[model samples]
Target: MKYLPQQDPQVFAAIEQERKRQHAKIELIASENFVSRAVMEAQGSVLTNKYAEGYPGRRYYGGCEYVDIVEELARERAKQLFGAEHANVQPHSGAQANMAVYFTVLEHGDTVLGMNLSHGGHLTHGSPVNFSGVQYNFVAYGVDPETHVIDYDDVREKARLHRPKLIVAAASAYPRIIDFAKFREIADEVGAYLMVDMAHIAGLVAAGLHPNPVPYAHFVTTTTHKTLRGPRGGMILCQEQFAKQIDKAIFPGIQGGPLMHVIAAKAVAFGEALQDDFKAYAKRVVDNAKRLASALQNEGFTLVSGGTDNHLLLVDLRPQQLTGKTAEKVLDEVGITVNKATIPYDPESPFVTSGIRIGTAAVTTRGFGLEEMDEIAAIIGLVLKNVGSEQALEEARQRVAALTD
Candidate 1:
């Protein structure tokens, strides 16, 4: 009468083992989070069997009535959550959402200005390796060398000189609250459309922990995962005037047959985010990040931009006499997970980056507080201090194992 697991016991055992391993470890990757069980259930619901090709009330499939209601609810909640005139919950991922925005507004060969990939910007912002850069002309801006912060004056200068069609105000690694209003001024000065990517800090924005770009930017895009803690998907929000164009671009232009199950999950996530407790959790994420950053600094590690204003921080491991790659590998071995990330204006390649990014979303979700962050910082410090010392690494690894266990 119930659905059964037909796989071998060994296969199920491995799955259980991995879940236990995750539960026991500290996950510091900024772009990750543990979704609630309700969200998980929604993601695996019967909604997966539907094929809702078009928007609500305009679906291509006959049995999409309930699916259409789910999607409409998602759109309405997303609009309220972010204070946008229109919201599209159909993008499969943040990259697709960005593609929709670009295709809707810009033509091939049109110039766009974005944050430099190596300078904390996302690939979709215009990395030459991505479709955005290949199809359009891209000029990049970076942070100030002295402050390790975005140089808005440089952005203004570039916009004045290049007169790009779009100016993207977003980042993948930089650890500061962006000035979207100022970006709006720059866009107006250059007569360009302003697109804000809040993928990394959507929760912070929703919780009022960071500035929301919706009111200032012409268009906004975000992944429903990361800080939002939704299923893996993307969303686009824009002014009412651009609503039709955005929908058409996402469906007819880039993708077809939106993920109905994921949309259901997103609706669940949006509902969760609307609760007062979710805002409190979001606030705690930033607090833990700050505590961790401070601990690292007190332990004599160099933090890019001095500190963080959001849920993520970039630590320069070079000062600790460790390469980012080595630090990442050593940390993973110690049951503390983090990612090697490229620093702004990094001299080393991404593979051998000088920085490691850390976050508190997952740990905070697991009920970690400032005290736990201190322990995490100490563990990282010990791992880096004994980089090539196998005996020391083993001893520290045991300590980490004890903490997780």
Candidate 2:
């Protein structure tokens, strides 16, 4: 059981306590999951000691034979899981994967169009503060003001006007299925390459629960740790024609040696995804999300985009007379961990957003189902009803603990 040498009992005790806390609480964070022990073992293996500066067989350092096998396995499994023509399991994180794609295909200051940040897009999808925005001419398209869903017409119009070199189809808080085919059409019409950031729905896509963007997008990027439930890493997939350029962009163009241990862990996760049970798990995740969304709707909570077709929901808190920060803090006190997120057409700033995003991925991994979701929804309702009441928070905490017991 002992991994690290005993340095400070207090620090070790805190770590153990946090582990127990995770065991006891409901983890609703959409981007988080519980990976298998096998995946963890690979991530902590001796491969971590190796520094593979290049691709599998073409490493800059000596003694990379085993690491080569690890990386190649990761690549092949990734291609199988997502039906991608080529897979690069390097790029340390999703942002880096995005950067690699941009660097490989577009010149500096080239125009690019992506989803609006406040309307479900990720920071890498051209937020002003991110490198994508700073270096390139970034244009954004948001969802319809009333429907709170993407308007493809608006997207096409923006593309027509901006003439961006790349068009990104992706989102971080979006709760519906994306139309990669339509995006591909738009990109083709505008003479632009399409890139899909499947970071949030990679598992769903692999399980065939969502549309596969690999066939439509010229490049696709995803984080391995999210719904994919692997080690913390990122990956890029592209057509075979662009394989060399993507690989070079990921290595000497951006990062140094790849994280071999994480790549090996990704291979394990991809293997898990190929199983029948993983598909069942993905379907259950959607079912649990529907149950939670329905319960919240019945309780008079406003769900953005009407409801979710995937694993997450954005609950607008203005109707409940609360802020996202307040709801997040109160839920945390009651052992329910959800994130404060921006709603489509949000009126408040990101720091004081009037919405909370909930997801079933992590809790479903912990073996929760529809019945647990109903109870969790009730707790959320009670907390919202008494937003500033200390007693309500304590009662919700006790109820959540009762579920675990």
Top model by lDDT, which number?
A: 2
Estimate every model's Cα lDDT from 0 to 1: 0.90, 0.91
**Candidate 1 on 251-333: residue-level lDDT in tens?**
88899899999998999999999999999999999999999999999888999999999999999877776778988888888
* Candidate 2 displacement at residue 103 in angstroms: 0.8
Model 2, 91-136: lDDT tens digits are 8999999999999989999999999999999998887789999889
Off by more than 4 A, model 2: 5-11
- Cα displacement (angstroms), candidate 1, residue 310, comes to 0.3
TM per candidate: 0.97, 0.98
Error of 1 at 14 (Å): 5.0
TM-score of 2: 0.98
